[PDB]
DNA sequence: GTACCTACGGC
DNA sequence: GTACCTACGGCT
DNA sequence: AGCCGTAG
DNA sequence: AGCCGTAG
């Protein structure tokens, strides 16, 4: 019929907004991922693109994701995937790429026709135990596939790699952190649910950007952590040295997070052309794969290069703010969270995942034990089994006779009919007894974990600690007072 | 990127505004071409609540829509030169197709309100399955959305103009807080 | 040797590129009528199990597979090639089954590969039929991680049917499409007369049959093309002159020539009138719809010989176009200009080879099966000792060796037994074996007989061609008007 | 799209002409930025044996190459104003890579023949294989083709002038028949 | 979601 | 073969 | 002011 | 002419 304009705007704009907040531009607090990422990673998984295997072309990988999970543009997906494989974008990179994946000069990647990708070993830890009923799968957009609602995420990905999303009516801006410090923060929290954010910052000293650099002071850090919002001052690593004959130069070896290096030098050369700064005679980019970032600024003779350094911090991105705005999806709705809350949520997720895996492990173990109980009955009375089968016309009559004669379940009787003649040799009989004995011991160990919450809790601690020891690394960003 | 009909009688002429050049081609192919015109949009369009009227006139898509309709703007409008009596908004039945709808209604309200008033504005009802526009053959678009016999246009009616003003300035305006309050109020997860 | 004569580098480089384009890009194969991009796409749909009973797949995924697996080139090249194969106005017998906007006659570009879907047509099944019966020679792919076919089995004359066009280096190709019914009647005549003349063949194959219909003026150009492999064929649109009211007239066009753009042709006619290069035209319209098919209307000015206007339009517009026949294709992986008889000869030899190799495969396969069943009879007959032997044994190897010595079994019969499931010991399994075995021996005899005689093999090809001709054959569209 | 080097010393400077924006990125990152410049080409370049002068001069590819070389063209060619004493051609090492090489050599012979005679023109030897330039990291391009101490560069020798003339005419000119006969004579379909 | 540059041969 | 146009928030 | 990152 | 269709 008809439609009021005002009612149509409210309905249509509200649908778009919610569809950008959830299901587009904000990360989930539990795995720290936005949908495109989660779909890329699940895809890499379900395609079996693990670190042991050779790379696959990105066009194939992006083709699968667009069609099975993510009904959007290939650009929106490759670009997202490119950022996941840049050591200067991601603090712990989730994709392992081959070919040109971009540089700090705002340098784009090569075409997806060319590059190839697989998982990293740490991505393995994101997806570990997903196929073991640890998280809930849901239907994809067309109902023709199933996708994860969240990933097992065996390390704190939200805080490790951070996030940025311009949503609608809100935004998020979360900085990367150091994995060793996060896990230790989680372990402290795990031992004292009432630990304070001040007490937690004894573990998490602050953000830790992939590009190293400096941080000025902890007043913005402590505000961000305790409230969710804070402003944090970043600076480059720059020293003053001599070049010969009393002349000095400035050497820059680390730049702020998310700053285009080429864009920054332009700004410097621009400020020089426009005479907005004094004392600069030369400016080169001496950067290479063999020496890393190196930007020199030659200083005019007998001129105070420290003064020039201090004015470059005022006038160039050499100094840059980061506006911490920690808004994540908690229970499917957006929320500005402090540090403790963000760790609390990730921990209750780990509890859930490990318990679910244990219960899944327990069910599958008892199923396989049940099957083997029947196989051993078959071995014990093989003469009678064969009689029983030879004496039957169909598969069904044989199945009914077995169930009846030997008190077997249907699954047991089926497992017997399906057995191959080869499984009757000396060694196959032994393998079956042996699998049984091991499975019994294993079942026992699983029930012990599910019998107590402290043993479960401790099991979580152990597995985190193992991850930390294997993947944890040194702080890069220096926090200067 | 405009493709007109043959009839020069606006009483019967219709124009459809399609989302994306892929859908653009599809619709140009299945239409009646005698009374139906097509003009595609190359994705998300300008938001005219946030532009200082300087770049609005640099927007090629904006300029092309004016030319197609054959009227003017604001104080220099004329309903009687409108080349069509059915200006139909046709976008993907997904949330991005909705956003674009909102960006068009904003343009109409602040520039061609008399067309809303004259009821010359409509909204096509494409099959509300998951399948976008670019993904449909031409025969489907005809029978479901283009054919005057089977289709189901929604006509746009302008009521409390004061209320509409306040709505258009909350959802599309430059004050985020009021928009953020509206989302939180009316959020149905 | 860190130097290079500029003449030698240019010679070897250009020769490398020419040869590559000629034998691996732009020229079709005389056997299956397909170019490597096209062969890899079809092989891709098959290996992806995209048969026409399967629902449609994201084209992006298909092109992704093809690009990664067999065809290391621009995705735009692969997709556009896939597009053309799904267009009823490009392919006389279309090979791809498209779901989405796949283009129009106006040069309406098809939608992007994320927006389209696709699967095989029924007739591509006949192209790929018997691919996994050792009928054709497979080869390695570019990286050495895949196997791709060097030629499809092509159970109908695809080359002449859908035609080809390709710009290569040193040479280009332009083979028009044909009517399948005439082609098959042509191959059959050939198979009954190795010494058949081109005139005799043209009693079946009148001339090209374009998917766009239209007319052809005369059999002169056609005859030259079929005899020399080269010739010019005049394609004219189907126009009629009719009354539009009040003594006014109009020309109405309903079919246009092959490979002509409808919009671009209308530009030229509009341009002609605008620049006053033709008189008597009051209006021009394109009243084409789903419902009416194609319909271009040309309003003739009152009191003008609409037939003279019509004749000028043919003369000065794409309304009439020529087709430069240039039947070049790969024969033994070498470019050659072929006449019609050559093309039909090479195809029949392909079909003979295919059907021959399929039979040997089936023979070898049936023989292998029976050899298994014999091992199985003996097994079931002594099932009590079989098990004891298996039970008494420590390893599979020990089991196998005992079985063979004790029961006179080959290694592959002893394996077949060790793999057998307990449920095969049921009551009436012995009979299935006994039933299947005898049926097998029957089949074996049939196969060996086909290979015994050449005339029987050739008769088998004729019969399998006739089926296709009856299931897939269709009426001619293009009228060859004798004038 | 040029990306030049630091040194103003032409003798030590080298310019790499690469296939594709895709590989241009990679080489831009793995080179010695002090003495090594880079200019990426979008696919197939113009074939100056067939094209007339107006079209050659409006072509951006050509333009960017003349400017970056700074020697001018034809009579105005001045070798003294060579900005690099090494112009290095770098393509995919497939059949299209070959073709692009022939086009570039045609341009140099007809418009900058002294560069060849002066030996300033080299051909890169990237690792042969199924992979092309766009599918390589920046380190594996340095270490194999741009690192002076590891790479192997083929210098382009011009000897018999008249033989080169007739060769370029035959392989690249507008007369197809001579091309066709050449292919037929030499085509070794292995 | 563009405008689209090039080679290649035959009319 | 390679394009730039827009929305959205918050920071400068 | 414009740039960050998923979207059309 | 410029356009056919695989390539960069
Ligand atoms: Mn884009
Ligand atoms: Mn017992
Ligand atoms: Mn959509
Ligand atoms: Mn392309
Ligand atoms: Mn290549």
Author numbering:
A (entry chain C): 10 to 490
B (entry chain D): 417 to 545, 580 to 639
C (entry chain A): 9 to 491
D (entry chain B): 417 to 545, 580 to 640
Task: Provide the authors' original text about this structure.
Staphylococcus aureus (S. aureus) DNA gyrase is a type IIA topoisomerase that can create temporary double-stranded DNA breaks to regulate DNA topology. DNA gyrase is a bacterial type IIA topoisomerase that can regulate DNA topology by making a temporary double-stranded break in one DNA duplex (in the gate or G-segment, forming a so called cleavage complex) and then passing another DNA duplex (the transport or T-segment) through this break; this is accompanied by large movements in the enzyme. DNA gyrase and its homolog, topoisomerase IV, are targets of well-characterized fluoroquinolone antibiotics (e.g., ciprofloxacin, ofloxacin, levofloxacin and moxifloxacin), which continue to be widely used in clinical practice despite serious safety concerns. Such compounds, known as topoisomerase poisons, stabilize intermediate DNA cleavage complexes formed during catalysis that lead to accumulation of DNA double strand breaks and bacterial cell death. In vivo type IIA topoisomerases are believed to use Mg2+ ions to cleave DNA; however, in vitro, both Mn2+ and Ca2+ ions can also be used by the enzymes to cleave DNA.
Here, a 2.58 Å anomalous manganese dataset in this crystal form is solved, and four previous crystal structures (1.98 Å, 2.1 Å, 2.5 Å and 2.65 Å) in this crystal form are re-refined to clarify crystal contacts. Finally, an S. aureus DNA gyrase binary (DNA and protein) crystal structure was also determined, based on data collected at an X-ray wavelength of 1.33 Å (E = 6.6 keV, above the Mn K-edge) (see Section 4 and for details). This structure shows that, in addition to the fully occupied catalytic metals, whose occupancies were defined by ensuring that their temperature factors were comparable to those of the surrounding atoms, additional sites are present with lower occupancies. In addition to the expected crystal contact partially occupied manganese site, density for additional manganese ions was seen near the quinolone water metal ion bridge in this binary complex with nicked DNA. The structure showed large anomalous peaks at the two catalytic sites as well as the Mn-coordinated BisTris at a P61 crystal contact, and unexpectedly, it also showed a new Mn2+ binding site close to both the free 5′ phosphates of the 12p DNA on both strands in this binary complex and close to the side-chain hydroxyl of Ser A84 (or Ser C84). In standard BA-x nomenclature, we named this site E or F/1999. An iterative refinement strategy was implemented to estimate Mn2+ site occupancies, in which the correlation between the Mn2+ B-factors and the B-factors of coordinating residues was optimized. ijms-25-11688-t003_Table 3 Table 3 Mn2+ site occupancies compared to anomalous peak heights. In our experience, this P61 crystal form tends to grow as two crystals joined by a merohedral twin plane. The anomalous data were collected from two such crystals; therefore, the crystal structure is modelled as a near perfect twin.
